[PDB]
RNA sequence: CCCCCCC
RNA sequence: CCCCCCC
RNA sequence: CCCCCCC
RNA sequence: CCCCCCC
RNA sequence: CCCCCCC
């Protein structure tokens, strides 16, 4: 059945159309040196409103890939959003859907903070501490990638995890910019990813275009590391299933587990059939996701969760254990094997 | 039977949930230098109300371990208390559940006492006599640890013992701070330990995180000494039983003692089975405590109490002697062996 | 034969169905802070009718475990009772099967008593003497656990023992609430346990979920102590048999005792085979109980009862002595060994 | 319906 | 995020 | 039929 | 029910 | 609480 369902979904002669009357903003590569400034003036000043930081990160992505490539990416993502270009005025940027009041506020706040830290201090600002640093857009996109790995999770868990992991992953940027509010920027990125779902596709295309590069700075290598940490998002049950098989859990040989193993292997075969893009299904909110669910094998899922709980892997996972006796037996065996 | 009871209690697939709608306060490490001041402004001034001194000690513990680690500790203790962070205002602290009037009163009393002892005296206040000393939070937590060792006992015995032992254990702090009211601070700590039972788990986690440290001041070494003096709390009968076995008491060979020795050894085997965390069962008020009771062996308990009374160990122990003839015979033999 | 009987009972491919058209009440955790009030307004006032105090204790248990977990517990206990949720009205509770007149009467009686004790007295009601104390539901469940240990016994013995033991076990609660009628509350709990047998399973699940907790108050530790004192209910003959073996009674070597020792050891092997849940068989009224009866070994039972009578353990046990000569000989030898 | 930990 | 020794 | 004390 | 001394 | 000499 599962192969037939995927065959129906894949073999479609008709293309969906959505967001027909909508538009979005991009910034041409000719403005990259400008957007960098903006992407850094968000980082070293303490701003009251961090509402469009995610849009500025996506603007930098658009400068990197190019306006035409970004339009093509949005078009092939199933969304008929018409790209609107970015202009300059007196210079500053007039990004579509980003209020000019916001850009002026961010610029003025950063200029005032820079003046205050230059007047009082000894005037020895290093090359990495200024807003026009060239890795500041990647530093903002690193907060974006941290909150990207938690798009299958909830908002509160995502924000808490982003802050916790960014105090260590982004320690160097925090030292360079003492006053960068990872919570508010992470909230902005979560809002962008939820509202504009095609920007998940744009962000993934940037991740690919960055990982495929021949050279990169440490910021881009960090961004790619986090982006790849997001790969199996929304499918931790499959990873824990292969973990359970590697652990040689005895309760995998139970009668009901052996009964469901056929369709479990069917799900894994479907994973292989989709191939490399299967991992990005839940990150993209591809409607095709959910063909990879193991919820139709309650006993296998309970055994997998029990094995994970025994090994300590389960952590604070919020999934359901359908069959509690199998869960407890598997947990006991996994603890025994671990000890 | 006892092994089966412990097997039932330990092998539970369901987690309890309590204090669901409740919250508690923590203080981030970034405020440690501030909380230290507070924890010392309780010590060198004579305050009318010592109500929240225990909460300030626990706040310092939260600064030491960290807010996130403290939340995790509270969560793994079986209590679903939602941590509330600590803020500053004009600076002073606004601790959740601690009235700002109390903090202002403590600060003002300490400032007035400092002004009085500076105006009249010769102005030679040493570095250890000021409230901002860095061992003052540990000095307060030492009163807390003294009253911690008496949580299995009663309130009046606990307070009397705390004052008696603190006049000698904490003599140096008393010399440094002539006006520190060990009775009221001990009462505050007893109130905290009784009301918020998860703070027993927090206090034990601080004891572990301190004993595991590579270095420490003399205050922290004293705190760990007292904390370890609290280890076997609520189980002095087992310690006196192994004492009686070491004393080779002849009445241990009586018919009824030899009858009960099997299940006595069962209790000791259960002690070994639980392992290192068995000693902290009564300190934590773990409901699992009471599996270690020797009350179901009245003759063994009477012989043990008699041996203790003969050796002079019994002191003023308030336990019951079930069989008075065995108690008296064991006491006579123990006195004879002692002489 | 006994192993074969247990094999038949255990290896059943068919599940029983009972209480098909019946329903029961639970209270969601969101109402715990409310049910606590009710569970305490039963304790400090003198009520004419104590009819549903047991149902209110079970309601608190349902808040603790959760409505869904309680439904699952009732379902796995062999009873197809449909859980009915609890609602609020103007606030007070409308518990299914509990008349709103009863709840209004209890609330009004408690409010009138509180007004009388506040108007006449000096207005210094401590935090533990008020109905909204958080250990009041556990104090009611402690009377419930005392009457739980006497479910194998008769009603009159159970009530007498509950009152006698509660004057000492629950002395602190009695001091806090001078007017709490342990007899009527114990009668209510006995009625609940007899009528709704699935509530024995719910009460045992609460005992497990409480003993497995990492922390607990003194009320919960007391409840777990009593709950574990109930463990071997309905099987005091097996405990006295192992006592007789520990006593090395000479009449155990008699011809008929040695004749029956084989099937006696068979019963003990069956005990080990069932394992931890064997002790709760008579408490649950599991129909499988009675496989553990030693009534088919009249001479062993007579020797065991004689040994118990000699040691003074028999107390006022109402079992039958089949062979009086063995009983008297064993009693004489046990007294001789005791002296 | 699905998802849910850590890095 | 990653990296981190010696030759 | 079974259960039946004390804690 | 459990706990109960001293350090 | 612990420590406390000599070399």
From Swiss-Prot, chains A, B, C:
The keyword RNA-binding is annotated on this UniProt entry: yes
GO CC terms of this entry: helical viral capsid; host cell cytoplasm; ribonucleoprotein complex; viral nucleocapsid
Listed InterPro entries: Pneumo_ncap
Signal peptide: none
Record bears the keyword RNA-binding: yes
Superkingdom, natural source: Viruses
Main location, first listed in the record: virion
Pfam short name (any one): Pneumo_ncap
Assembly with partners or alone: Homomultimerizes to form the nucleocapsid. Binds to viral genomic RNA. Interacts with the phosphoprotein P. When in a monomeric RNA-free form, interacts with the phosphoprotein (via N-terminus). Interacts with protein M2-1; this interaction allows the association of nucleocapsid with the matrix protein.
Protein family membership: Belongs to the paramyxoviruses nucleocapsid family.
Protein name, as recorded: Nucleoprotein
Organism in which the protein naturally occurs: Human metapneumovirus (strain CAN97-83) (HMPV)
Lineage of source species: Viruses, Riboviria, Orthornavirae, Negarnaviricota, Haploviricotina
């Amino acid at each position: 059945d599962l192969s037939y369902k995927h065959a129906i979904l894949k073999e479609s002669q008709y293309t969906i159309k959505r967001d027909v009357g909508t538009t979005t903003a991009v910034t041409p590569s000719s403005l990259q040196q400008e957007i960098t400034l903006l992407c850094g003036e968000i980082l070293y000043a303490k701003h009251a409103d961090y509402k469009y930081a995610a849009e500025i990160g996506i603007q930098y992505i658009s400068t990197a890939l190019g306006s035409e490539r970004v339009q093509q990416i949005l078009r092939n993502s199933g969304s008929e959003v018409q790209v609107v270009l970015t202009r300059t005025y007196s210079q500053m940027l007039d990004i579509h859907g980003v209020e000019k009041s916001w850009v002026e506020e961010i610029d003025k706040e950063a200029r005032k903070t820079m003046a205050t830290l230059l007047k009082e201090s000894s005037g020895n600002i290093p090359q990495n501490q200024r807003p026009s640093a060239p890795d500041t857009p990647i530093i903002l996109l690193c907060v974006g990638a941290l909150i990207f790995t938690k798009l299958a999770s909830t908002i509160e868990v995502g924000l808490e995890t982003t802050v916790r992991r960014a105090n260590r992953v982004l320690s160097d940027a925090l030292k360079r910019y003492p006053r960068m509010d990872i919570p508010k920027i992470a909230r902005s990125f979560y809002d962008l990813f939820e509202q504009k779902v095609y920007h998940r596709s744009l962000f993934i295309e940037y991740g690919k275009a960055l990982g495929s590069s021949s050279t990169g700075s440490k910021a881009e290598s960090l961004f790619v590391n986090i982006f790849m940490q997001a790969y199996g998002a929304g499918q931790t049950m499959l990873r824990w299933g292969v973990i359970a098989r590697s652990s040689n859990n005895i309760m995998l040989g139970h009668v009901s587990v052996q009964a469901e193993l056929k369709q479990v292997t069917e799900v894994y075969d479907l994973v292989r059939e989709m191939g490399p893009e299967s991992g990005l299904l839940h990150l993209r909110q591809s409607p095709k996701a959910g063909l990879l669910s193991l919820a139709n094998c309650p006993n296998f899922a309970s055994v997998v969760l029990g094995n994970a709980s025994g090994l300590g892997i389960i952590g604070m996972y919020r999934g359901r254990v359908p069959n509690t006796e199998l869960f407890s037996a598997a947990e006991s065996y996994a603890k025994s094997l671990k000890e």
